[PDB]
Design a protein around this nucleic acid. Sequence first.
DNA 1: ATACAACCTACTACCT
Lengths: 99, 100, 50, 469
Amino acid sequence: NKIFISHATPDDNDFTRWLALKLIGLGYEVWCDILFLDKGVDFWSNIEKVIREDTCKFLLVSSSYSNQREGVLKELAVAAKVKKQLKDDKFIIPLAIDE
Amino acid sequence: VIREDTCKFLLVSSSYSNQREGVLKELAVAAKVKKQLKDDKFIIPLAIDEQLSYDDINIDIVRLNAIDFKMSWARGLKDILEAFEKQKVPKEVADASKSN
Amino acid sequence: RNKIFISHATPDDNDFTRWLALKLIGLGYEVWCDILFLDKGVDFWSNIEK
Amino acid sequence: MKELIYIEEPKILFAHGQKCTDARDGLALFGPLNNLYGIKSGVIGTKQGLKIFRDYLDHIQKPIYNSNSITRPMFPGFEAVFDCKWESTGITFKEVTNEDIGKFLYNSSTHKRTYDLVSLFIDKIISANKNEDENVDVWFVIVPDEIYKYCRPNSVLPKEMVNYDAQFHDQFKARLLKHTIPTQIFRESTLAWRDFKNAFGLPIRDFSKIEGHLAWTISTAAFYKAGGKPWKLSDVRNGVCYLGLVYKKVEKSKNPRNACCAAQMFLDNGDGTVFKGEVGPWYNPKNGQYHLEPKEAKALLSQSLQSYKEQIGEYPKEVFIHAKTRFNHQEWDAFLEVTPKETNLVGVTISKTKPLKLYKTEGDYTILRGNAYVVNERSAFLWTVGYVPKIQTALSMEVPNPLFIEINKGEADIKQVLKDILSLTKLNYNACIFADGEPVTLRFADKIGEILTASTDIKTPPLAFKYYI
DNA sequence: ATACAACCTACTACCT
Ligand SMILES: [Mg+2]
């Protein structure tokens, strides 16, 4: 029942923090990599497990920094595979934030 | 040896090796060397297991073009050699005495 | 900009695509096809987009 | 308390001039000597048989594993080993109707039934060979298990369901020798053992742990039948020709006869191993006597020497005649009247009747393979079956039996004879295994004899083994 | 034609 937000980590932090806190205040479970002050040993494996087993929506922060970022693209591919698995057409919802 | 010696990193992709801890550590080190070396085709996954679907490969592999060893090993080896000659992977003269 | 891109269903239109690509290469046209020019161990979607 | 002598395991030769002890491993790493381009297969049988064969052919290409890959090596697929195509797309089908099979299957006489079924298959084989424009390398005959069960010489047909040898396989292969067509006979239960179960709901034949071994054997036999050489001997000497003589009883005629067939092996100038037959089975009119007449012995040795001279250019320096029987004085004198002065004739008797068993004192395993017990300058025991350290298992089942090898006639070194026999045990092309017990010459002479004494109308049979094995 | 010893083949049955 989680909501995964994928973004460029140091560049799109303002909008990601704003949106994550707004969604949390509205009663949603949000999974974002900036909502964890201490990072565990297993990051990428845990990220893939979260995408495959927990999230129900995949919000992508589409900007210029996040267009061709390796981590964002890997999460996008895993989320596309998960969307194919769950037979849900609107699993991935991109957000255009960069002019 | 991964950092200073290898020019290609072949990874046997199977259900057993999909989530193995040591294999994942080697994959992370290989990815680091791949980013350092500016080599787009440093990591080559060889898909050998029919049980492991293409939708279940780990996050570090799901984006790469794999070599299909499921239907035929001879076709897979032909593809491996074709890629190696196409990418100018260093090699010596063929000699079965070393294998023996 | 010399490449010629051929899009197809990868495992179902292989015969016609290979025939047409080899023919077009025969008359000096540069052709890009995923069954003949897509490298192994590469990010194939990013490569196709580029 | 007596002593033993060890004989080193022979090495067979593979592609790129690479030597090995295991045929399967040598095939897996290096590959066959020949370069076949592909195998075009012709399938005969009901539609279910064709489906079974197609499914097995598709299954062959993918790697196949056994329970233990140390004792029994795995099969990496047909093309990965032999570097040639044997696919299901090259299949040519000649359908045999189930109604046609049942028309002849349920008959009072087993001779008539087996003749009718054999003729039903062979008519289609020859018609497709002559009147069809496609090329077929090997013909695969898928036989329903009823045909196998009810066509044996001593098989009885239940009363509720009611020349030439009364055996489907031997009569089938004997009546196809005029057209020189290599044939592989399969049973439907061999390639579809899962679908045939007993009253307890389990398969009659369990290939779950030996699937790769079955694949190895079938693929090696098919590759040999199509004209490929998988391996060859590496240590055999020059100028020596090995002969193997086997006698068989012929019940087709009113008067019993003992037909003697032979197998001949040697080395050509191109370093290739020439291994073939020696046929025109020289008969004996006396029942119970397994000794050749002087005229027939002269003809046999003259034909063998002439073949060797034609293939090489000069008469052999040494001739070894492996036989399960003991040569007598008259036959050996007849043999010596043909050989020149430069040719040394040695007659060796190989038997498996002597009951000597060696039990290891403090283990659950058996005596090592290659061990020998030289009785005297003309007699020894050889343990061709036993524990093989390479596969960590024994070829035998409970306790291996030894070969009592005796130099009956002529002068030769007994250790050299044992080495030659233990090297010959590696040349079985009918199977893909570690070395078997008997020498390949005697075994393949027996295989030739079991077919040449089935049908009488065989004037001049072929020499190649793909028409017999 | 009986007794024996020393060799011979044909035809199945079961294990992996
Ligand atoms: Mg055979």
